[PDB]
Amino acid sequence: FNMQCQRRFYEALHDPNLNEEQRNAKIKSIRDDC
Amino acid sequence: FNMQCQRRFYEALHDPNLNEEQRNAKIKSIRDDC
Amino acid sequence: GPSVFLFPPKPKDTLMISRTPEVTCVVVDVSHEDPEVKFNWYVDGVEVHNAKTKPCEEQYGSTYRCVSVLTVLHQDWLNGKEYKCKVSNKALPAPIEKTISKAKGQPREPQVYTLPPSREEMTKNQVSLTCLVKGFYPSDIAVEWESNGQPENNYKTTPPVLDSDGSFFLYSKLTVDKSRWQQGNVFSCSVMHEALHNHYTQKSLSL
Amino acid sequence: GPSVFLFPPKPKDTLMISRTPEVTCVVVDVSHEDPEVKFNWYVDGVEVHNAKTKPCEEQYGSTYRCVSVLTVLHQDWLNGKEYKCKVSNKALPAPIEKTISKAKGQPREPQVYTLPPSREEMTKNQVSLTCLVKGFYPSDIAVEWESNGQPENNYKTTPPVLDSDGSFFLYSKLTVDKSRWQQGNVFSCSVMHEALHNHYTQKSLSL
């Protein structure tokens, strides 16, 4: 699997500066543009 | 547990020179007398 | 009458962004006279509509099995959201509802340790490469093996065992010919768990 | 109605002449109006009389459960004799029969391998001593730990896992304080199985 995207997923998942809406959008971006 | 008796039990259990009757008796003596 | 089962996603699918986690609703023993089922799906009680429901399939007893599959967002499953399947049928006065979610409780990070074959096992034609995974909570986990950037599929993993401190452990055993092991090939245990950084860690094992 | 379960002896009890193997017949959900059961025991179909039957006891609800325990000969269990429990009660039109015996198949001897703690686990307060037991059939087995001639009870053992060659394996893990491990104490994994010489083997592990 692509370890780059997995790292970006995890960092977004646990980013305390993101609320649920911002976290979903950034995870959706990783899911879609990897 | 007593390892002596356990050895004697196992030897009686697998002795090819004992039929079921003779094996039961040797095993019963082991279990009864030590 | 018809009975309903609701299955959670595979642990690996919830953890790896490359996968698609799904929740699976299975209704069995739908009568032959009323072969039609309707599924409703809900996330924390709010209906969702993206389910893939395939047509019902007839079984031996002439009753019908019917499966609906709901894909879920990784972060919603990991954040404890509650997934509900409702099954409606004419043979039923009231629809059946089952609900599932992730195991509750503070997550705990697995410690991963590789243990090489003992000297006694080296006398055999095949040896056991051991991966000990201990201290994790909840019990959802995936363990895999690779070598030289290729998957090794000849392993068996024990079910998680509840330890005395409220955490789980398991062992994974990869069997390899002693010749492969003695030629110094590097093997790796890969563990996927919610409480690991990146949900992923890989431990190596080599002679 | 009333239902009957028949439990095999403990694997250790059938193997060690110091122990007494027993088969246990449990009937639950006996009506309150007929708090009366009759046990009949049979070995390969021939009635035997040595069972110890305790009086029925009533549970929550009004129903009763009723237990009968039959001691068996080690060699008879190991040699595949078939033990049958017949439960009779006035509520039941027909008595209920249950039968058990040892798993059948060529016995295979377990290979026992102790694995010391990973060098990376020596940074923690406690370490894991591992006993790998593989290649055994049938799955009936007992595993215990010792040190300095005294039992060590702080272990967890996985249930047996069927391996791909028709044999079973398991791991047993003994948790010890690292200090105990580092001060040179000898620890022992003891395994009991019908395919071991003397039904018993013990393997040691130390720094």
CA distance B22 to chain D (A): 12
Report d(CA C183, CA C206) in Å as an integer: 9
Q: Which residue, chain included where needed, has tokens 């019917």?
A: C66
Q: Which residue of A has its CA nearest to C196?
A: A10
Flag whether residue D178 sits within 8 Å of chain C, measured between CB atoms.
no
Report d(CA B28, CA C162) in Å as an integer: 41
Reported resolution, Å: 2.0
What ranges make up the beta strands (E) of D137-183? 142-147, 150-152, 155-157, 161-162, 168-177
The DSSP symbol for A31 reads H
Tally of structural domains, chain B: 1
Farthest-apart Cα atoms in chain D, separation: 67
Report d(CA A30, CA B20) in Å as an integer: 73
Q: In this complex, do C132 and D114 lie within 8 Å of one another by their Cβ atoms?
A: no
Judged on CB neighbours under 10 Å (0-12, 13-18, 19+), C89 is: buried
Q: In this complex, do D132 and C128 lie within 8 Å of one another by their Cβ atoms?
A: yes
The DSSP symbol for D73 reads -
- B30 to B12, C86, D14, D22: CA distances (angstroms): 9, 65, 15, 19
Neighbouring CB atoms inside 10 A of D77's CB total 23
CA distance B24 to chain D (A): 8
Report d(CA C97, CA D15) in Å as an integer: 49
Q: Which of A2, A9, A22, A32 to mutate to test the interface with C (most CBs of C within 10 A)?
A: A9
Flag whether residue D132 sits within 8 Å of chain C, measured between CB atoms.
yes
Contact C138, C103 (CB under 8 A): yes
Report d(CA C91, CA C4) in Å as an integer: 14
Flag whether residue D50 sits within 8 Å of chain B, measured between CB atoms.
no
Helices and strands (DSSP H and E) totals, chain C: 3, 18
Q: Which amino acid is at C177?
A: D
**Length of chain B, in residues:** 34
Contact D13, D22 (CB under 8 A): yes
**Chains A and B share 3 or more Cβ pairs within 8 Å:** no
Report d(CA C36, CA C92) in Å as an integer: 12
Judged on CB neighbours under 10 Å (0-12, 13-18, 19+), D140 is: buried
Helices (H), D62-162: 74-78
Report d(CA D188, CA D114) in Å as an integer: 9
Neighbouring CB atoms inside 10 A of C142's CB total 18
What are the chain D neighbours of C130 within 8 Å (beta carbons)? 115, 130, 132, 171
Residues 6+ apart with CB under 8 A from A29: none
Residues 6+ apart with CB under 8 A from D5: D25, D26, D27, D28, D98
Report d(CA D94, CA D11) in Å as an integer: 32
Report d(CA C18, CA C2) in Å as an integer: 35
- DSSP for C18-74, written as a single string: TS--EEEEEEEEE-SSS---EEEEEETTEEE---EEPPPEE-TTS-EEEEEEEE--H
Q: In this complex, do C73 and A30 lie within 8 Å of one another by their Cβ atoms?
A: no
Residues 6+ apart with CB under 8 A from C11: C140, C141, C142, C192, C193
The DSSP symbol for C140 reads -
Instruction: Provide the residue range defining the domain that includes B14.
Output: 3-33
Q: In this complex, do D113 and C134 lie within 8 Å of one another by their Cβ atoms?
A: no
Q: In this complex, do D111 and C118 lie within 8 Å of one another by their Cβ atoms?
A: no
Q: Which of C171, C176, C189 to mutate to test the interface with D (most CBs of D within 10 A)?
A: C171
Which tokens in the block code for residue A6? 């997995």
Q: Closest CB to A1: pick one of C18, C75, C78.
A: C18
